[PDB]
Structure 1
Amino acid sequence: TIDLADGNYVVSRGDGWILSRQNQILGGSVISNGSTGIVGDLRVNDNAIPYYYPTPSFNEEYIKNNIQTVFANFTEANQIPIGFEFSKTAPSNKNLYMYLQYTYIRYEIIKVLQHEIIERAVLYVPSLGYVKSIEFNPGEKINKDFYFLTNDKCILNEQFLYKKILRVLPYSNGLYVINKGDGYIRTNDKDLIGTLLIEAGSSGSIIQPRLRNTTRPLFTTSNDAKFSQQYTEERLKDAFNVQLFNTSTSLFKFVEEAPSNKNICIKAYNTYEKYELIDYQNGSIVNKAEYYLPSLGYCEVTNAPSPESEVVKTQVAEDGFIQNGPEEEIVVGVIDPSENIQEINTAISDNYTYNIPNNNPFYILFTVNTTGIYKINAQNNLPSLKIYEAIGSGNRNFQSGNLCDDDIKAINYITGFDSPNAKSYLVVLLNKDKNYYIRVPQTSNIENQIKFKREEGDLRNLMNSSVNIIDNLHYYTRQSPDVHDYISYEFTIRLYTSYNQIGTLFRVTEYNLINIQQNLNLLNSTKSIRLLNIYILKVEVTELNNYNIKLHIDI
């Protein structure tokens, strides 16, 4: 008598099923005088073999396929040993006897016809164990229900999980790896290691001891081309220096001690750490791959519900992920393996002119000889360059007056537009220890030259900012920087911005910039300046409400 439609169904009745008559077949332990007894087992071999009970229509292959498609794949998980243990202390007057029995997960392939279950096939998958204890005295009579079980029972809560059978990211163009958090579990208990029911006064523990080091990562790419499985692994190794993907030697173990008044049920799941390898281009993601690196488990502690309160036939949730860990998101830029990385082997002293040697965008690695503010303009500022800082560089191999290539590919974007037609130059504070990359975009026949120059004073005020040389003063649109970042416009009066939300206008004296105004809110401003018929306007973004920023400049 069911309330479903006609057809076949796959049902999971949950974990915590104890078989009949198989109670004391494993043995028991007797402890006394305050001694502590620990009984455990290791689900690895010959005790992780499922028990099939097939009906004529549902054979073993049908059962296995239609159960492993929707629910946890026990075939793959049976090769990895999993340990469980129960410990109990006897009273320091009496004796305690406690015995262990395996628990199972029950799966039913059923056939509903006219709201009636007319045919059933049952699979018992070996889950963790369960220990029953009693404090006894010599000659005491113990109820026969303690030793012997006549019918299969669900010690845990019943379930009938069934299924019918048929914002604005102010990034720059490039590759990013995003650590999206830890503690991801698949739906429908597809990653559940298992459940332990700890009785009052006892303690339970579930351990993955890494006896077999293999792990199963999960991959999902939006394009097999480019973002492949090996490509994503290489980018993860470039970003977070991840070395082991399908291997791990980190044991983990969850221990729960139930109180002296009630019982506890603890469920252990395998977890994952989510990595997203986006390909942010022009304000939108053009390629995205999701990598789930096997993490170190999750433990959920619960109490048994009311006895047989209500067993509700609930459908399975859609295939997905649930994050039980803390909310995290870390973005790390990665050098595109596409481009070549030229190196400047000599530390830039006070002035340098790197002569650019194909026509493809590339990287130039360099370090300065003294921490200071540098201008990195190009030949006539025709190519707009970008600058990145190598994360973690400068805390290792060091050679005075030379570039020690620490082969770091995890770059942090500093400043620079991606527009290939805008004329601009960078003004950046560079540390002596750290190493910096300069991305030159797609070049053309002009040789061009990147000019580094020590800027002491004057232009040393637009630090970590790109200044675009507007030579047509009308509005200009650029890649808006993030909050608390800087942009600048140099032009030969109404000044404001369209979408985004400080500001400062300096007059240049050929530079010797002198401030004329400050704290100018450019968000839909309507004030006037009436400057004398060359000035530089520096804007700091306080609220990134759009990918681009528009510089409305009206005479």
Structure 2
Amino acid sequence: TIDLADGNYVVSRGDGWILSRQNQILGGSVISNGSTGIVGDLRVNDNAIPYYYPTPSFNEEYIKNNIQTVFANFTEANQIPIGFEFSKTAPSNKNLYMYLQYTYIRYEIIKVLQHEIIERAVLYVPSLGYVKSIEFNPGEKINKDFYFLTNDKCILNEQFLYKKILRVLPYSNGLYVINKGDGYIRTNDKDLIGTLLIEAGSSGSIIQPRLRNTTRPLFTTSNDAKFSQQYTEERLKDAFNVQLFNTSTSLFKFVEEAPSNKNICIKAYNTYEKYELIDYQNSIVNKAEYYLPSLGYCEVTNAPSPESEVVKTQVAEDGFIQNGPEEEIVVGVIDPSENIQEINTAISDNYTYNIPNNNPFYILFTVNTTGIY
């Protein structure tokens, strides 16, 4: 029984769901006598296909479009491999058994009426894995709850994010490029690589191996005239010498080793770097925002909060949040419209240059000996 108003809604129960009875299908590993075992997977293909459970009101296309518009777009991410791995060390004299399953992000679309839900369509999006381990001795009887799961559950913190369905700048006239920093992430976990739960004594890992070099830079201009993706890219190449925009071969990996008496939750997001292409003149006249992919960000929850209540919450307005250090690096740039005439001879004392209609222009020069001119 929800306390919202009537009509449809889009709900995201979050990441960290494990389906029922799909526990041991992937198999397990047995370690002994102080050895170390590492298992893992790469969410690339044949395992990144979402599972749809629709209702006549909500068909597959409806669910897909509605969730992708508001929450993370999984169709695009389904082609970029992401790898995860759990490592565990067995004791000196004992045996350990550890088995792996997949964790899914759960989305629901509902149709509230009179504070009562009368429909529910579910989408499960594969995100990452979860490894369950136990040290045993021969003949021990294991609780059935360790192997078998009768109903789905959220090992991570529960959530119910939802969204109802309807200073003085002393610069000179010219162009500039401002790098505003690194570690920009879109709101509503829209740029989330995934979440990993590491049990006591283990060590999780999330790796972006760049098996596919593609990337998804984001562009936003206040005026399509005089500005465009190509124009801003060329200006950045002139300013910061950026050679690759929609490509990259740099890998980022995050590793966390949980202590011996607690559990850890590591969240990995993709990050961005913000480049503002202003056109200050006398008072900003134009602005563009380029978000070049960075090498990710990692947050570490020491442990899930004690189960008290699933407090409903609404999605934040679309935007960005910066997690890296604050910076503002300003670089001037030559306006391509103006012409630049190069002087083939070095300039000595007492030189004259003949202006060679009313448009502005550029002249490039260098002196023959250091001094004041």
Tell me, yes or no, whether TM beats 0.5: yes
What does the per-residue CA deviation read over 1:370-428, in whole Å, with 9 as the maximum and x for residues that have no partner?
00xxxxxxxxxxxxxxxxxxxxxxxxxxxxxxxxxxxxxxxxxxxxxxxxxxxxxxxxx
How do 1:409-428 residues align onto structure 2 when only pairs under 5 Å count?
Answer: none
SS of the equivalent of 1:134 reads strand
Residue 345 of structure 1: how far off its partner (Å): 1.1
Q: Is the 8 Å Cα contact of residues 216 and 293 (structure 2) preserved in structure 1?
A: yes
- 1:287 maps to which residue? 286
Residue 306 of structure 1: how far off its partner (Å): 3.5
What does the per-residue CA deviation read over 1:246-304, in whole Å, with 9 as the maximum and x for residues that have no partner?
0000011000000001000000000000000000000x100000000000000000033
- Give the distance between the partners of 1:274 and 1:200, measured in 2 at CA: 38
Residue 151 of structure 1: how far off its partner (Å): 0.1
Q: Is the 8 Å Cα contact of residues 16 and 155 (structure 2) preserved in structure 1?
A: yes
- Give the distance between the partners of 2:89 and 2:82, measured in 1 at CA: 24
What does the per-residue CA deviation read over 1:496-554, in whole Å, with 9 as the maximum and x for residues that have no partner?
xxxxxxxxxxxxxxxxxxxxxxxxxxxxxxxxxxxxxxxxxxxxxxxxxxxxxxxxxxx
Residue 305 of structure 1: how far off its partner (Å): 3.0
SS of the equivalent of 2:72 reads coil
- 1:320 maps to which residue? 319
Q: Which runs of 5+ in 2 are unaligned?
A: none
- 1:415 maps to which residue? none
Residue 308 of structure 1: how far off its partner (Å): 1.8
SS of the equivalent of 1:63 reads helix
SS of the equivalent of 2:351 reads strand
SS of the equivalent of 1:14 reads strand
- Give the distance between the partners of 1:164 and 1:100, measured in 2 at CA: 36
What does the per-residue CA deviation read over 1:305-362, in whole Å, with 9 as the maximum and x for residues that have no partner?
3332121110000000000000010000000001000111111111210001132101
How do 1:45-56 residues align onto structure 2 when only pairs under 5 Å count?
Answer: 45-56=45-56
Q: Is the 8 Å Cα contact of residues 200 and 258 (structure 2) preserved in structure 1?
A: yes
- 2:201 maps to which residue? 201
What does the per-residue CA deviation read over 1:454-484, in whole Å, with 9 as the maximum and x for residues that have no partner?
xxxxxxxxxxxxxxxxxxxxxxxxxxxxxxx
Residue 61 of structure 1: how far off its partner (Å): 0.2
- Give the distance between the partners of 1:163 and 1:349, measured in 2 at CA: 69
- Give the distance between the partners of 2:3 and 2:318, measured in 1 at CA: 24
SS of the equivalent of 1:287 reads coil
What does the per-residue CA deviation read over 1:113-160, in whole Å, with 9 as the maximum and x for residues that have no partner?
000111000000001000000000011111000000000010000000
- 1:13 maps to which residue? 13
Identify which range, 296-305 or 173-182, moves more after superposition.
296-305
Aligned residues: 371
- Give the distance between the partners of 2:275 and 2:304, measured in 1 at CA: 37
What does the per-residue CA deviation read over 1:14-57, in whole Å, with 9 as the maximum and x for residues that have no partner?
10000000000000000010100000100000100000000110
- Give the distance between the partners of 2:34 and 2:235, measured in 1 at CA: 56
- Give the distance between the partners of 2:347 and 2:304, measured in 1 at CA: 71
TM-score (norm: length of structure 2): 0.99
RMSD: 1.8
- 2:352 maps to which residue? 353
State the identity as a percent: 100
- Give the distance between the partners of 1:331 and 1:257, measured in 2 at CA: 39
- Give the distance between the partners of 2:309 and 2:321, measured in 1 at CA: 25
- Give the distance between the partners of 2:71 and 2:183, measured in 1 at CA: 19
- Give the distance between the partners of 2:304 and 2:148, measured in 1 at CA: 25
Q: Which runs of 5+ in 1 are unaligned?
A: 372-554
- Give the distance between the partners of 2:286 and 2:88, measured in 1 at CA: 55
- Give the distance between the partners of 1:181 and 1:307, measured in 2 at CA: 35
- Give the distance between the partners of 2:272 and 2:308, measured in 1 at CA: 34
What does the per-residue CA deviation read over 1:212-231, in whole Å, with 9 as the maximum and x for residues that have no partner?
00000000000011111110
Q: Is the 8 Å Cα contact of residues 156 and 304 (structure 1) preserved in structure 2?
A: no
Q: Is the 8 Å Cα contact of residues 17 and 153 (structure 1) preserved in structure 2?
A: yes
Q: Is the 8 Å Cα contact of residues 279 and 287 (structure 1) preserved in structure 2?
A: yes
- Give the distance between the partners of 1:306 and 1:9, measured in 2 at CA: 27
- Give the distance between the partners of 1:152 and 1:173, measured in 2 at CA: 61
Q: Is the 8 Å Cα contact of residues 184 and 322 (structure 2) preserved in structure 1?
A: yes
- Give the distance between the partners of 2:51 and 2:103, measured in 1 at CA: 12
Q: Is the 8 Å Cα contact of residues 102 and 129 (structure 1) preserved in structure 2?
A: yes
Q: Is the 8 Å Cα contact of residues 50 and 126 (structure 1) preserved in structure 2?
A: yes
What does the per-residue CA deviation read over 1:153-190, in whole Å, with 9 as the maximum and x for residues that have no partner?
10000000000001100000000000000000000000
Runs of 4+ residues over 2 Å off in structure 1:
303-307
- Give the distance between the partners of 1:336 and 1:309, measured in 2 at CA: 59
- Give the distance between the partners of 1:220 and 1:340, measured in 2 at CA: 28
SS of the equivalent of 2:291 reads strand
TM-score (norm: length of structure 1): 0.66
